[PDB]
Amino acid sequence: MRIILLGAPGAGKGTQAQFIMEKYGIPQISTGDMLRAAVKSGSELGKQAKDIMDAGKLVTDELVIALVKERIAQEDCRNGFLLDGFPRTIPQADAMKEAGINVDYVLEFDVPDELIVDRIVGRRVHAPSGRVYHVKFNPPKVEGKDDVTGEELTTRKDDQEETVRKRLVEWHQMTAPLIGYYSKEAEAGNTKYAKVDGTKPVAEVRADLEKILG
């Protein structure tokens, strides 16, 4: 069982990751984990990727594909894998198919932009402590203040309404062809695809997945 898991930032696609891992006996893998593990391993693709990173440059599609190919060859992925957040472009999807990295299911996690905004914007932090708060799901005892110190809270640049909306626009635009690429491969019969309403409770999403995957 080889699964691709796509979704917008804050769509909470990972909320079903452990369920998928436990029902198939497969690891969760991401390009990030591949990079940090490859450089730590002192392997070849590692030293190469370490230079690009430390130089502050982007990693080439060519190098990423080679890392994915490397990872799914281990005994780890005898029963398959759960690829998270990759591919991100059509050319990447092609290079994977070129590298013989076939996939059984492509799951798309759907949460409308508006719900993600309210979900993300609500987050606050007390920086010197690292303590996390939320207006609606995890409210502090004293509104707009830390429960412990009593020092005022703070919000980060990454959770601001304009920053989030800007981040979602880019993703939708950038991923639009990829969603069509895999949706077409579905009706073509080279793989399977399925939209998923992530707005439902965790239990119902798990149910929806169990029938999609079987």
Side-chain angles (χ1 to χ4, degrees), residues 1-122 124-214:
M1 174 60 79
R2 288 174 176 194
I3 297 170
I4 286 177
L5 187 66
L6 303 180
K13 49 175 162 64
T15 62
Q16 294 291 326
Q18 283 187 18
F19 159 76
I20 298 164
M21 284 192 290
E22 288 177 28
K23 283 292 293 300
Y24 293 93
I26 53 173
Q28 183 192 32
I29 51 173
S30 63
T31 58
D33 288 19
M34 293 169 193
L35 290 167
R36 292 184 291 265
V39 299
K40 179 183 172 185
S41 297
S43 63
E44 175 35 45
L45 277 34
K47 297 178 185 176
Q48 184 174 344
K50 169 160 176 138
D51 294 338
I52 276 78
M53 290 175 58
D54 294 13
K57 304 183 294 179
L58 284 175
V59 175
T60 68
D61 286 4
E62 197 177 12
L63 180 48
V64 180
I65 294 290
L67 278 168
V68 174
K69 186 174 184 166
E70 183 188 42
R71 178 52 168 266
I72 64 155
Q74 307 180 21
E75 292 83 63
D76 224 320
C77 310
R78 169 193 166 92
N79 295 312
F81 60 76
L82 178 60
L83 184 58
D84 188 16
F86 196 80
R88 280 175 261 95
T89 69
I90 274 172
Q92 291 170 359
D94 292 324
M96 264 168 59
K97 194 177 58 167
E98 281 271 32
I101 304 167
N102 290 320
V103 167
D104 307 322
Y105 285 84
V106 179
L107 308 177
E108 193 213 331
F109 232 76
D110 268 316
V111 179
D113 300 338
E114 292 297 340
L115 292 175
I116 301 172
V117 171
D118 304 330
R119 184 179 303 191
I120 293 293
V121 168
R124 293 98 209 291
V125 62
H126 175 242
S129 51
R131 278 176 265 274
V132 294
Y133 299 95
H134 178 213
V135 186
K136 304 173 182 178
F137 179 78
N138 188 27
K141 314 231 200 67
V142 186
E143 307 304 274
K145 274 209 196 123
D146 192 38
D147 290 332
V148 177
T149 50
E151 292 171 347
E152 279 165 278
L153 299 179
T154 315
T155 297
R156 305 155 186 159
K157 189 87 79 59
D158 260 40
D159 326 296
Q160 288 149 358
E161 188 172 351
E162 297 303 297
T163 301
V164 179
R165 279 195 159 85
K166 191 217 172 298
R167 188 168 61 202
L168 293 173
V169 165
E170 286 189 352
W171 186 86
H172 283 321
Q173 183 64 29
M174 167 176 164
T175 318
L178 182 54
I179 294 170
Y181 172 93
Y182 278 139
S183 178
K184 209 198 195 101
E185 292 270 315
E187 62 182 15
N190 298 321
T191 178
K192 291 180 174 184
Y193 177 89
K195 269 183 168 65
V196 182
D197 185 356
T199 320
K200 296 164 178 159
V202 179
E204 193 174 351
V205 177
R206 183 171 57 263
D208 295 6
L209 288 166
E210 241 162 7
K211 296 180 179 181
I212 290 164
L213 307 159

